[PDB]
């Protein structure tokens, strides 16, 4: 019996159809994440008993921070082949600046961006 | 001296120019919010002493809840029944469903969207 109101917005993501004021039971609408956002969960929500099915989250990309690399004495190995912004699941390959050795308890030299977070490595003289 | 790295991404907002690997001192780039979002803070950030200044947040729109409305014995005043999504700062004017009166003593019939949250009236 229960119809659904309009579909809820989500961060960095849109519906692929124009919103209606009222949706019938079993109606579905479909979401789509912004370009560098990784669509996650169900791409379709469906109207089940007055309720909207839960909408996906859009996983954030990463920026590579010059601020940090400068601090942690690191540089990019393939500077030309290196994207400044990373989709989730895309990696970064660093290297120690000349005159520096890799830290001990540090993270590895290659690091995948996961939803906004990037684990950087550390270097010492 | 004190170049900046790529500018920081913000939710539901992009920069207006193509992003660069390195920005000179005094550089500035500009944020704009996705269509139904409202930019709060400085639209423009600037590179000083190797650091980007604070980026704006993009305040959220509100979706009018049917589930809520029916439950509060309210509905949209007719000429506004098509305004499903409110930009922050945009208002929804409510009326009481036939029969009920303004509850004792809820928030006003007129109510404003602030960053995705709407304070509904009750009847």
Numbering used by the authors:
A (entry chain B): 205 to 329
B (entry chain A): 205 to 327
Give verbatim excerpts from the published study on this entry:
CFH and CFHR proteins are encoded by adjacent genes and form a protein family.
Patients with the autoimmune form of aHUS nearly always lack certain CFH-related proteins, primarily CFHR1 (CFH-related protein-1). We found structural differences in the autoantibody-binding site of CFH domain 20 and the corresponding homologous site of CFHR1 domain 5. Also, the hydrogen bonds stabilizing the loop in CFH and CFHR1 are clearly different. Second, there are no direct contacts between the residues of the CFH-AA site (Arg-281–Leu-288) and the molecule in the neighboring crystal cell. Our results suggest that the reason for the functional difference between the most C-terminal domains of CFH and CFHR1 is their varied ability to bind to heparin or glycosaminoglycans on self-cells because the loop that has a different conformation in CFH and CFHR1 contains several of the heparin-binding residues. Our model provides an explanation as to why immunization against the CFH-AA site could occur only in CFHR1-deficient individuals because, in normal individuals, the presence of CFHR1 with an epitope similar to the hypothetical induced autoantigenic conformation of CFH would have guaranteed tolerance to that conformation of CFH.
